[PDB]
Structure formats: structure tokens, C-alpha cells
Design a binder for this molecule. Structure first.
Ligand SMILES: [Mg+2]
Ligand SMILES: [Mg+2]
Ligand SMILES: [Mg+2]
Ligand SMILES: [Mg+2]
Ligand SMILES: [Mg+2]
Ligand SMILES: [Mg+2]
Ligand SMILES: [Mg+2]
Ligand SMILES: [Mg+2]
Ligand SMILES: [Mg+2]
Ligand SMILES: [Mg+2]
Ligand SMILES: [Mg+2]
Ligand SMILES: [Mg+2]
Ligand SMILES: [Mg+2]
Ligand SMILES: [Mg+2]
Ligand SMILES: [Mg+2]
Ligand SMILES: [Mg+2]
Ligand SMILES: [Mg+2]
Ligand SMILES: [Mg+2]
Ligand SMILES: [Mg+2]
Ligand SMILES: [Mg+2]
Ligand SMILES: [Mg+2]
Ligand SMILES: [Mg+2]
Ligand SMILES: [Mg+2]
Ligand SMILES: [Mg+2]
Ligand SMILES: [Mg+2]
Ligand SMILES: [Mg+2]
Ligand SMILES: [Mg+2]
Ligand SMILES: [Mg+2]
Ligand SMILES: [Mg+2]
Ligand SMILES: [Mg+2]
Ligand SMILES: [Mg+2]
Ligand SMILES: [Mg+2]
Ligand SMILES: [Mg+2]
Ligand SMILES: [Mg+2]
Ligand SMILES: [Mg+2]
Ligand SMILES: [Mg+2]
Ligand SMILES: [Mg+2]
Ligand SMILES: [Mg+2]
Ligand SMILES: [Mg+2]
Ligand SMILES: [Mg+2]
Ligand SMILES: [Mg+2]
Ligand SMILES: [Mg+2]
Ligand SMILES: [Mg+2]
Ligand SMILES: [Mg+2]
Ligand SMILES: [Mg+2]
Ligand SMILES: [Mg+2]
Ligand SMILES: [Mg+2]
Ligand SMILES: [Mg+2]
Ligand SMILES: [Mg+2]
Ligand SMILES: [Mg+2]
Ligand SMILES: [Mg+2]
Ligand SMILES: [Mg+2]
Ligand SMILES: [Mg+2]
Ligand SMILES: [Mg+2]
Ligand SMILES: [Mg+2]
Ligand SMILES: [Mg+2]
Ligand SMILES: [Mg+2]
Ligand SMILES: [Mg+2]
Ligand SMILES: [Mg+2]
Ligand SMILES: [Mg+2]
Ligand SMILES: [Mg+2]
Ligand SMILES: [Mg+2]
Ligand SMILES: [Mg+2]
Ligand SMILES: [Mg+2]
Ligand SMILES: [Mg+2]
Ligand SMILES: [Mg+2]
Ligand SMILES: [Mg+2]
Ligand SMILES: [Mg+2]
Ligand SMILES: [Mg+2]
Ligand SMILES: [Mg+2]
Ligand SMILES: [Mg+2]
Ligand SMILES: [Mg+2]
Ligand SMILES: [Mg+2]
Ligand SMILES: [Mg+2]
Ligand SMILES: [Mg+2]
Ligand SMILES: [Mg+2]
Ligand SMILES: [Mg+2]
Ligand SMILES: [Mg+2]
Ligand SMILES: [Mg+2]
Ligand SMILES: [Mg+2]
Ligand SMILES: [Mg+2]
Ligand SMILES: [Mg+2]
Ligand SMILES: [Mg+2]
Ligand SMILES: [Mg+2]
Ligand SMILES: [Mg+2]
Ligand SMILES: [Mg+2]
Ligand SMILES: [Mg+2]
Ligand SMILES: [Mg+2]
Ligand SMILES: [Mg+2]
Ligand SMILES: [Mg+2]
Ligand SMILES: [Mg+2]
Ligand SMILES: [Mg+2]
Ligand SMILES: [Mg+2]
Ligand SMILES: [Mg+2]
Ligand SMILES: [Mg+2]
Ligand SMILES: [Mg+2]
Ligand SMILES: [Mg+2]
Ligand SMILES: [Mg+2]
Ligand SMILES: [Mg+2]
Ligand SMILES: [Mg+2]
Ligand SMILES: [Zn+2]
Ligand SMILES: [Zn+2]
Lengths: 110, 181, 117, 141, 53, 69
RNA sequence: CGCGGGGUGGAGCAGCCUGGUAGCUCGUCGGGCUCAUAACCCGAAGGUCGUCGGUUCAAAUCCGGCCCCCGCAACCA
RNA sequence: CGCGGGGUGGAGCAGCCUGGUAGCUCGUCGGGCUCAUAACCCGAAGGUCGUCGGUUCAAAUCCGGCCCCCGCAACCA
RNA sequence: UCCCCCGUGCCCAUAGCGGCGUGGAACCACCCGUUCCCAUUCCGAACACGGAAGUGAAACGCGCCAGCGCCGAUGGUACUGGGCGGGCGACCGCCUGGGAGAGUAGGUCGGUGCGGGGGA
RNA sequence: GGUCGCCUCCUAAAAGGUAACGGAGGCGCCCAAAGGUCCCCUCAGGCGGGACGGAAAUCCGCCGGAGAGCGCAAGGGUAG
């Protein structure tokens, strides 16, 4: 048995995993949003940015933009520039979008 | 969100009675209406006229929502029925728009029907929900006789969080659902 | 749905339009009108709701009508068939109850003609 | 006359008859049974024939069990015709029996009665046979 | 194919060359076939239309 | 709500055949009805109405006893 | 054994190719004419399509097996 | 592929050359006569004149394209 | 470096179904609202956005129990690569190496990787 | 008499291949969406409840790993 939730997840995640790039995963809780970057070859998170960890607040979308930007800072430092965006079970829009838009001008190539 | 009549009777009268009747510990345990779905199972408009939109305008009138189509799943010969033929309407009432339909139903619709002698008690779902059938549809007040071509019934389904019929029986009886026996 | 449960014909007089209920005839029409001072020759449409509400709340209560009436008539007949009276047997066969000739006619009680070689 | 009610396929290849019986080697119902000593295609005619013989022997009484069933279609080309031009027609059904397979069983009839009845039955069968009594070994299986 | 599922060429409207050949159902889609397609001659894309095979 | 297909819903006044005013919301702001929730015979306690015992029947028929016991 | 045709109201034949819908003549039953019978006129009933399977939303109709009837074939020695 | 001519009411149909009328027979309906049956006779319903575009005061009648049925002749590696 | 939670892989049911219990500090979830972005062949159910009054009822996490499901030896046998023997014949049998399936004993209410948040 | 090319399954003896006038079936098409992509959705069936409404029309609830669907025969594949 499966929720449409889970089905979407696998469906969008698998497609990205095939392209073999680094993976920018995202979690979007009611109160926060989190974004880690994963090497699925080794199965390991290389760098992570989040609202909770940023001790951040001030409207979800505007917040989301920053965690992306912050994510790029720690990423580019390590050497990461090329990446693929795991949009999870979430429609590419609003909060998730803002995270991407931030992480974009933050320097990430995607 | 919007102050309405029936919602007040539930929240200020139905709720507590239920609590003292089954001794609910947690607040969300208390049974509540989830949604009300109207379904005019036509198919009388199968190959026939697209004048199911008359029944659709009549429908949207009663509910205050635009009704969606339902079309043939499989084709059936005995029914003169092609897979994909428009054969019904369905509209899902939630939140406040639900509360309004139920208020006008318990108060104005259900009495105005020919020889009303109570709702069927046995018609309970077995897992907390309830189903009934109308044949008229001028029975709703906002439908004068002049608007009607031919008669048309509909299938009302009312869905509650009630674990069982007992809890469901009570939630409905207390709201104003008149039962027959 | 207006009175007692089914909308009597508008545009036609009161005395007449009353008849169109399973329970009222010209007799109860002639009468029920008088007991609420309704103008006997006024069309249903011409009726003020003042006149309407009064003749509505009147008749519904005063007499057994329609479904409840018919169910009672039906329940009346069921009684006959159960005990086994002659009229009860005549209802069992569908034959003429009120003591008649069946050699000819009697076809209203038993419908269409069923010819045999 | 035994034969399948319905059949996925009408003609069936012949096959070999390797080994001992695959299973159905222990008495499972009555007190005595008839066991196959050598393998064969047991015809539906023979099954029925044995069946009748026992029935007849203890006229009215006891119950007969039949642990074999003819599901294999047996083919035969017509008389006096040559090889080739298709496979022959189905002309009957057999049950493939192998040594160790209990084929019949009886119950609720006296020991002597059972012995004669099962004995006569074997005489109808195209193979050597032995009668057996239900054992501690059978109930253990 | 058949009398009804027919063969046809796609002709570039810009320079009138036929650069592709395909099919269609005549009964189902009875109109000429309009389609953008690359033209090797014009070296761009072009609206091509159906042309009797 | 996907508007542009839905009928507006203004406050409604359904005064019935017993004067019983019930305000609510509906498509029509003015609508009338005969019998209602209040004045329906089934709803009101039980109401004899005109059904009392199905006529002077059966053993309770009276109108007899030609005896002086 | 081989090949082709056929089985549809009581009788005799259409409809199958192209799936949805059962027709014709006779007979039969009821009513007319006639003193009566027939001829004649009016009106009606009657099959669940050989039998099993299968395809299909749907089968007299398309596909496989079996049964009965019909025609053709069965030569070289 | 190249020619020739048709589509007109339910069936068949001259009207088309020569632009002003959707006409004829058969079919169905009603009425007359009838032993009846036909035939006869009076009336009547029934069409965008294949499509779409075009010359014209107006065209089934004349043009261009297109659909379709029949027809003519030739070709088929 | 032990404990709890969140995201995420790997092993692919010994991990599952079902039952009973536990958890809201934090996280997470239901939850609150429909102004805005977005959305419903009807419905803010879903998707989406702005929130934080309430609640762990649901969901989820963590436990516990073996009815189900799942896993499942050893021992023995079927069958068999190779080498042989007996019988007119049907078929049997021997050495050597390999060796199931079923069933019996029995196991199981998961185990682990990387990052994030919170603890003692 | 039947057959003649192509496809599916068995025969085929656990790689590939393998014969017979051996056992079963199909093809000579089709689709301007039945194609490309992006986004969303998940079956069949069972039980219960529901005016006309039935075994089966459309609606509600619970169950359900795939027994449905995938134009067409069969096989393989397939709801991550
Ligand atoms: Mg499952
Ligand atoms: Mg999904
Ligand atoms: Mg999916
Ligand atoms: Mg790994
Ligand atoms: Mg800030
Ligand atoms: Mg910016
Ligand atoms: Mg760059
Ligand atoms: Mg509101
Ligand atoms: Mg309360
Ligand atoms: Mg219908
Ligand atoms: Mg009344
Ligand atoms: Mg009766
Ligand atoms: Mg009479
Ligand atoms: Mg059987
Ligand atoms: Mg052998
Ligand atoms: Mg063996
Ligand atoms: Mg052996
Ligand atoms: Mg052996
Ligand atoms: Mg065996
Ligand atoms: Mg005995
Ligand atoms: Mg013997
Ligand atoms: Mg023994
Ligand atoms: Mg013993
Ligand atoms: Mg035992
Ligand atoms: Mg251009
Ligand atoms: Mg064309
Ligand atoms: Mg161009
Ligand atoms: Mg009141
Ligand atoms: Mg009361
Ligand atoms: Mg012939
Ligand atoms: Mg032929
Ligand atoms: Mg013939
Ligand atoms: Mg034949
Ligand atoms: Mg035949
Ligand atoms: Mg026939
Ligand atoms: Mg005949
Ligand atoms: Mg003939
Ligand atoms: Mg035929
Ligand atoms: Mg034919
Ligand atoms: Mg006669
Ligand atoms: Mg005569
Ligand atoms: Mg069938
Ligand atoms: Mg038929
Ligand atoms: Mg059949
Ligand atoms: Mg037939
Ligand atoms: Mg046949
Ligand atoms: Mg010769
Ligand atoms: Mg010679
Ligand atoms: Mg002619
Ligand atoms: Mg430690
Ligand atoms: Mg983990
Ligand atoms: Mg592992
Ligand atoms: Mg699992
Ligand atoms: Mg349990
Ligand atoms: Mg327990
Ligand atoms: Mg407990
Ligand atoms: Mg416990
Ligand atoms: Mg406890
Ligand atoms: Mg808190
Ligand atoms: Mg605001
Ligand atoms: Mg607005
Ligand atoms: Mg807006
Ligand atoms: Mg958009
Ligand atoms: Mg919008
Ligand atoms: Mg639609
Ligand atoms: Mg839409
Ligand atoms: Mg739990
Ligand atoms: Mg237990
Ligand atoms: Mg167990
Ligand atoms: Mg397994
Ligand atoms: Mg072992
Ligand atoms: Mg060993
Ligand atoms: Mg060996
Ligand atoms: Mg060996
Ligand atoms: Mg040897
Ligand atoms: Mg030897
Ligand atoms: Mg031996
Ligand atoms: Mg030796
Ligand atoms: Mg040796
Ligand atoms: Mg060994
Ligand atoms: Mg060995
Ligand atoms: Mg345990
Ligand atoms: Mg477990
Ligand atoms: Mg568990
Ligand atoms: Mg543990
Ligand atoms: Mg380790
Ligand atoms: Mg030949
Ligand atoms: Mg091989
Ligand atoms: Mg198509
Ligand atoms: Mg979508
Ligand atoms: Mg969708
Ligand atoms: Mg279902
Ligand atoms: Mg049901
Ligand atoms: Mg149903
Ligand atoms: Mg019906
Ligand atoms: Mg449904
Ligand atoms: Mg299956
Ligand atoms: Mg299906
Ligand atoms: Mg599947
Ligand atoms: Mg499948
Ligand atoms: Zn070009
Ligand atoms: Zn009132």
C-alpha cells in the first residue's frame, strides 16, 4: 500500500538520481524548511542548510530564500558548484522555489 | 470563518451531549461531520440531450457549488451505455458550504416531501456514515415549480469521523436528523 | 409541494383545484371554502397568502388525505385478505368484490381480455 | 466413467514413468488399501471396473475410497491408416500410477470382507498389487 | 496501409521541397496535415503541409 | 474556490406556512415554504393530526351491545 | 478418412459476408360472410436461432470442438 | 494514373442543350366505387436539388474546387 | 563518544498485517485562515500560501505480545555429473562425487550508513 | 487433402541453437494522438450503505501488490 505522497516522492527522486549529479534534497515542514546536498553514490550528506539551524524566522517564503543562499555559501566553499534539485513530493513553487532561487544566485549551478 | 446556525448547534449543544454519552477523553475523538456529497445518478442523459446542464444548474442552485460530471467507467450493452458517456453529477460540500446545505435540508427540504414519516435507521454505513435518497428536487425551497422540466432524484451521502453507527446515530440524531422507527 | 403535499393546479378556481387531492371531492370543496370564508370562484393564483395559509392549515389537519389515506385504505384491504372473508377472497383473486356477475364484463377488476383457443 | 469436466488442453504428450510414486503412498482414509507394485496407465475403464467389483462384493455396506484419477488424455490414431498427418484423437483417459501409490481404500466393513473385495479389485487392474492395513506409520504421515 | 490509411509527403511551404514522408487516416483526420519540421534546404524549421504522395 | 462558475450566496429569509422565520444563506435572498421543521406533524411530539386510531375500529367500534347482563 | 454446403415459430425458405435490428409464404387461434362448409375479409398468437465452449459493451451474425442432414471424392497397382 | 456523366421526395425520374416551373410514374395517407380484389377516379403529406466557393435581378440548369456511385480506356516492375 | 527527534540512503518482510501501550520540551503532524502566490473536470480533500488558538484523537516515532504473514536447520530422502553390475525383458541395484522440494526442530514485532536539531 | 512468409508459447533435455504432415494461437494492420514532454492521479475485485437503478450506470465507506490496464495473439515486462 502507498500514499500518493510516497509515489510522487519515488517518482521525482528516481528520475534525478539517474542523472548522477549531486542532489539538493528538501524538507518542508509546517514550521521550517531544510535543504541538504547528497552524494548518492557514497550515500552521504556533503553540506546542509536549514531554518531551525539558522535560528531564522520572518515569513516562510522570504526565509526559504535565505536558507538557499546560505546553503550556497557553505557549498561553494567545499568545491560544490554542479548540482541537481530534488523537489521532493512538493510542487516546484513558492517556498521550495524560493529556496532554489536563493541557492541559485548564491552560486550553485542548476 | 463564518457564523452559521447549524454549526452553532453542533458546537454548543451536540458536542457536549456526545461527550457525556460516550465519555470522550481527547477533544478530536468527538465525532464530527467531514463532508456531504450529492450525486444525481442520471444517465437518463446518456446518448440523450446534453440538457443534463438543466439538472446541473438545478444542482448548483441547491448547493451553491458548481457540480462536476461523472462519466461511464465501463461500457454496458444492457444499459445502452458507452464507456465515457456523461451519466451523472457529483458535488462535494465541505466546511461552511456543507453546513448551509444541511441546515436547509433538515429544516425545509425534508419536511416538504410527500408523506415524510422518518429517515431509515438501518441505513447506517457500519463505520459511521449515512446514506439516503430523494426523488423530488423541487423539494428544495430555491426551486420553484416553473424551473422544473421533469423530476429528478439524487443520492446524498454524509460522512462523519464516527468510529461506528452508534456514535454516528447520535451525532445525526442530535443535529436534527429525524429517524423513523 | 404546496398543499397538502402536492401542488394543486393554479390558474383554476378554488372549488375545482381542491378536488385534485386524493381525499377531497366537490363536497369537501364546497364546504372547506366556507369554513375559512374563501371566495368560492377565485382562482388559485388570485389567492392572497392570507387566504392560502388559512385554507392550507385547515385541510391538512381536518381530514386524512393522500398517502396516509391510501395506506389506510390499503391497510384496510390487507385486513380482509388475512382473516379470509368473501370480500377477502375476492381481493385475493382480483375478482369483483361487491357481489357481481363475472360471466360477462367484470373486466375492470381483472384488466385486459385474455382470449384462449 | 471418470474424466475431467473441463480441460486446458485436449491432447497431452505421453511422458516416461520414472521413479516410485510421487506421493499418495500412505493410507489416509480407511483401514485397508490397494497399492500399486508396478507402474502403468490405469484406464478409466479399469478404475470403474474395480470400483464396481468391490461395491458388488459387499452389496450395500462400507465406503470405497478412490485415490487415483484419470486426467491424462489417451490418444489413438484410426485403424489401418499410416504414420503422420497429425496426432491421433483422444479416445479415453488414464491415471498414471506408480509403485507405492495407494489407489483404493475401504472402511467400515469387516476385515475379511475388505480383504476379498480389495483382492477382486486388483484382478481388474493391469498390474501386480498388494493389500495393506492402516499402520502407526500411516497415521504418523 | 489501406484505401483509408494513406501515404503522403510533407512539403515545405517556404521553398516547396518535400523533405518528409509519412501517413495518416483519411477518414479520421480528413484535413491536410500541417506540421513544423526542419528543412535541410532552408536550414531552419518551416511549416510543412500535406501533399499527395 | 474556483469561482466564475458558482452562484452567489447572500443571506436568505425563509418565512414558512406557520410564520416561522428562518434566516440563513442561499442563492435566493427571498424564498417561501409551506410546512417546516417546527410545524411538521411528525416533528411536533407526535400529533394526532387526523390519524387517531384508523377510524372507529375494530373491537373498539361500539355502537352496539343488544344485551342486558 | 478427406473436401465443400446446411440446422432459424408446426411445414418450407430469408437474415450471417458488413455484430446492436428476426423477415416471407403456408399453417394455427379469435371475430366476419353464408342456411352451413370452403373460398374471401378483419385481428391475433407462436421461435428464446443444432449443442457445447470462446471473442466482444453486445453474438442467429465472428472463432474452436462435438452431434445430425446433404453433395462431391476415394485413383495407379 | 488519363478520360466520359451522374447525384433531384422512401424507390426509379425527364427537367439540364435553351437561367424565371423541386415535375412524372411507382410508394404511403385520407375519400369515391367495389362480392371483394385489383384497376379506375378526387385530394394529400413528403427535397439542402452531393458539398463548399463563384458569374447573375434570379439559376437543380452556368462556372472552380471537393466528396461519392457508375462508366470508358490504358498500365501493372 | 550514550539518549530522543528530523531529513535521507543501504539490506529488501527475521523489516509485514493485526493487537495493546507510550510520546508533544523540542521536532513533526493533524490544526487555524483564505488576503496574496498556487489550486479543484465540484470541494483550500488534494496542491499552495499567511499563520500558531488547540491536540497528540488521527498520522507518525518508539515500545510490548508470535493469531496471521515471513524466515527456517540438522537429520534423511528424491534427483543427478562420473564409473559399474544383475535380469530374455519390463525395470531395478552398486561405487564415487554433488544434493534438493516438502516437513520437523526453530527464528522473527528489524538491523545498519551519512547529515541536521535537541538533551545529560 | 493440407501446407509454403512473419510473430507468441510448448516440444527444447536449467547458456545459445535444435526436427517431425508434433501440441496450441496470432499477423499482412493500426494511432495527429494511441506520438514528444511537463505536471497530477492509481487498478481489478469483495463487503457494507445509497431515489428511479437491476448481477452490473453514477455516489459514500472500509478492505486490496496487482489477479486490472497496457489498440490488437501470446509471452515477458509493468502501479517506485
Ligand atoms: Mg501491500
Ligand atoms: Mg502520486
Ligand atoms: Mg506515479
Ligand atoms: Mg550506501
Ligand atoms: Mg530575520
Ligand atoms: Mg532576489
Ligand atoms: Mg557558476
Ligand atoms: Mg467562510
Ligand atoms: Mg460543546
Ligand atoms: Mg438511465
Ligand atoms: Mg398534510
Ligand atoms: Mg388486491
Ligand atoms: Mg366488457
Ligand atoms: Mg467433476
Ligand atoms: Mg518408462
Ligand atoms: Mg521419485
Ligand atoms: Mg527411480
Ligand atoms: Mg530408485
Ligand atoms: Mg505419485
Ligand atoms: Mg460390514
Ligand atoms: Mg492384476
Ligand atoms: Mg499393514
Ligand atoms: Mg496395524
Ligand atoms: Mg494425523
Ligand atoms: Mg516564415
Ligand atoms: Mg483527404
Ligand atoms: Mg515556414
Ligand atoms: Mg425555530
Ligand atoms: Mg418528538
Ligand atoms: Mg460450395
Ligand atoms: Mg468455402
Ligand atoms: Mg452454399
Ligand atoms: Mg461440414
Ligand atoms: Mg455447422
Ligand atoms: Mg440461422
Ligand atoms: Mg423448419
Ligand atoms: Mg431461397
Ligand atoms: Mg454461418
Ligand atoms: Mg458470408
Ligand atoms: Mg376463423
Ligand atoms: Mg362460409
Ligand atoms: Mg456470449
Ligand atoms: Mg441478436
Ligand atoms: Mg455462444
Ligand atoms: Mg448459430
Ligand atoms: Mg458451431
Ligand atoms: Mg486414372
Ligand atoms: Mg497402371
Ligand atoms: Mg431508370
Ligand atoms: Mg558513549
Ligand atoms: Mg534510518
Ligand atoms: Mg544488511
Ligand atoms: Mg516490506
Ligand atoms: Mg490480532
Ligand atoms: Mg495482544
Ligand atoms: Mg490495555
Ligand atoms: Mg502493553
Ligand atoms: Mg501505559
Ligand atoms: Mg509546543
Ligand atoms: Mg491578511
Ligand atoms: Mg479575493
Ligand atoms: Mg488574487
Ligand atoms: Mg500555474
Ligand atoms: Mg488561479
Ligand atoms: Mg467535463
Ligand atoms: Mg477546469
Ligand atoms: Mg501508534
Ligand atoms: Mg497474543
Ligand atoms: Mg509464528
Ligand atoms: Mg521470500
Ligand atoms: Mg539436508
Ligand atoms: Mg547427506
Ligand atoms: Mg550417481
Ligand atoms: Mg549416474
Ligand atoms: Mg546398465
Ligand atoms: Mg543386460
Ligand atoms: Mg533389479
Ligand atoms: Mg559394482
Ligand atoms: Mg565401481
Ligand atoms: Mg555423496
Ligand atoms: Mg549418491
Ligand atoms: Mg519475539
Ligand atoms: Mg514482525
Ligand atoms: Mg510491530
Ligand atoms: Mg530491538
Ligand atoms: Mg559497522
Ligand atoms: Mg494446393
Ligand atoms: Mg538448452
Ligand atoms: Mg481513434
Ligand atoms: Mg496536474
Ligand atoms: Mg489529476
Ligand atoms: Mg470498486
Ligand atoms: Mg454495493
Ligand atoms: Mg449499484
Ligand atoms: Mg427501469
Ligand atoms: Mg466511484
Ligand atoms: Mg493471477
Ligand atoms: Mg476491467
Ligand atoms: Mg502490474
Ligand atoms: Mg499482467
Ligand atoms: Zn524549405
Ligand atoms: Zn412555520
Amino acid at each position: 500500500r502507498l500514499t500518493a505522497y510516497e509515489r510522487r516522492k519515488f517518482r521525482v527522486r528516481n528520475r534525478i538520481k539517474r542523472t548522477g549529479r549531486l542532489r539538493l534534497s528538501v524538507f518542508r515542514s509546517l514550521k521550517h524548511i531544510y535543504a541538504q546536498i547528497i552524494d548518492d553514490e557514497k550515500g552521504v550528506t556533503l553540506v546542509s542548510a536549514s531554518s531551525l539551524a539558522l535560528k531564522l524566522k520572518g515569513n516562510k517564503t522570504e526565509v526559504a530564500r535565505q536558507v538557499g543562499r546560505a546553503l550556497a555559501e557553505k557549498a561553494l566553499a567545499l568545491g560544490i558548484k554542479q548540482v541537481a534539485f530534488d523537489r521532493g513530493p512538493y510542487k516546484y513553487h513558492g517556498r521550495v522555489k524560493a529556496l532554489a532561487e536563493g541557492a541559485r544566485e548564491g552560486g550553485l549551478e542548476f | 470563518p463564518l457564523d452559521l446556525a447549524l454549526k452553532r448547534k453542533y458546537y454548543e449543544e451536540v458536542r457536549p451531549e456526545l461527550i457525556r454519552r460516550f465519555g470522550y477523553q481527547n477533544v478530536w475523538e468527538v465525532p464530527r461531520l467531514e463532508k456531504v456529497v450529492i450525486n444525481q445518478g442520471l444517465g437518463e442523459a446518456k446518448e440523450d440531450a446534453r440538457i443534463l446542464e438543466k439538472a446541473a444548474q438545478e444542482l448548483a442552485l441547491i448547493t451553491g457549488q458548481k457540480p462536476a460530471v461523472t462519466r461511464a467507467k465501463k461500457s454496458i450493452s444492457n444499459f445502452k451505455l458507452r464507456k465515457g458517456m456523461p451519466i451523472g453529477l457529483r458535488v462535494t460540500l465541505r466546511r461552511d458550504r456543507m453546513w448551509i446545505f444541511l441546515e436547509k435540508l433538515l429544516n425545509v427540504a425534508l419536511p416538504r416531501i410527500r408523506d415524510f414519516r422518518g429517515l431509515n435507521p438501518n441505513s447506517f454505513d457500519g463505520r459511521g456514515n449515512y446514506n439516503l435518497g430523494l426523488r423530488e428536487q423541487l423539494i428544495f425551497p430555491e426551486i420553484t415549480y416553473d424551473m422544473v422540466d421533469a423530476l429528478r432524484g439524487m443520492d446524498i451521502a454524509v460522512v462523519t469521523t464516527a468510529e461506528t453507527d452508534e456514535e454516528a446515530r447520535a451525532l445525526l440524531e442530535l443535529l436534527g436528523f429525524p429517524f423513523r422507527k | 409541494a404546496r398543499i397538502a403535499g402536492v401542488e394543486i393546479p393554479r390558474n383554476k378556481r378554488v372549488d375545482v383545484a381542491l378536488t385534485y387531492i386524493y381525499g377531497i371531492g366537490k363536497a369537501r370543496a364546497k364546504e372547506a371554502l366556507e369554513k375559512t370564508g374563501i371566495n368560492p370562484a377565485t382562482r388559485v393564483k388570485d389567492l392572497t397568502e392570507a387566504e392560502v395559509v388559512r385554507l392550507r392549515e385547515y385541510v391538512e389537519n381536518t381530514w386524512k388525505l393522500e398517502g396516509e389515506l391510501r395506506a389506510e385504505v390499503a391497510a384496510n384491504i390487507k385486513r380482509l385478505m388475512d382473516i379470509g372473508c368473501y370480500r377477502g377472497l375476492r381481493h385475493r383473486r382480483g375478482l369483483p368484490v361487491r357481489g357481481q356477475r363475472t360471466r360477462t364484463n367484470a373486466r375492470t377488476r381483472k384488466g385486459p381480455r385474455k382470449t384462449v383457443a | 466413467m471418470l474424466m475431467p469436466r473441463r480441460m486446458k488442453y485436449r491432447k497431452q504428450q505421453r511422458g516416461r514413468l520414472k521413479g516410485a510414486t510421487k506421493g499418495g503412498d500412505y493410507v489416509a482414509f480407511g483401514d485397508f488399501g490397494l497399492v500399486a507394485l508396478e507402474p502403468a496407465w490405469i484406464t478409466a475403464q479399469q478404475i470403474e471396473a474395480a470400483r464396481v467389483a468391490m461395491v458388488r462384493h459387499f452389496r450395500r455396506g462400507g465406503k470405497i475410497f478412490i485415490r487415483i484419477f484419470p486426467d491424462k488424455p489417451y490418444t489413438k490414431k484410426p485403424l489401418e491408416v499410416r504414420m503422420g498427418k497429425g496426432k491421433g484423437n483422444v479416445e479415453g483417459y488414464v491415471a498414471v500410477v506408480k509403485p507405492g501409490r495407494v489407489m483404493f481404500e475401504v472402511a467400515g466393513v469387516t476385515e475379511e470382507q475388505a480383504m476379498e473385495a480389495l483382492r477382486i479389485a486388483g484382478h481388474k487392474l493391469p498390474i501386480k498389487t498388494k493389500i495393506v492395513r492402516r499402520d502407526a506409520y500411516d497415521e504418523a504421515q | 496501409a489501406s484505401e483509408v490509411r494513406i501515404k503522403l509527403l510533407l512539403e515545405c511551404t517556404e521553398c516547396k521541397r518535400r523533405n518528409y514522408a509519412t501517413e495518416k487516416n483519411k477518414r479520421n483526420t480528413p484535413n491536410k496535415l500541417e506540421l513544423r519540421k526542419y528543412c535541410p534546404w532552408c536550414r531552419k524549421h518551416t511549416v510543412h503541409r500535406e501533399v499527395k504522395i | 474556490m474556483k469561482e466564475g462558475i458558482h452562484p452567489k450566496l447572500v443571506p436568505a429569509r425563509i418565512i414558512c406556512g406557520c410564520g416561522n422565520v428562518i434566516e440563513t444563506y442561499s442563492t435566493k435572498p427571498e424564498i417561501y415554504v409551506e410546512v417546516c421543521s417546527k410545524c411538521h406533524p411528525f416533528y411536533t411530539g407526535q400529533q394526532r393530526f387526523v390519524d387517531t386510531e384508523g377510524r372507529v375500529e375494530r373491537f373498539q367500534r361500539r355502537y352496539g351491545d343488544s344485551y342486558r347482563k
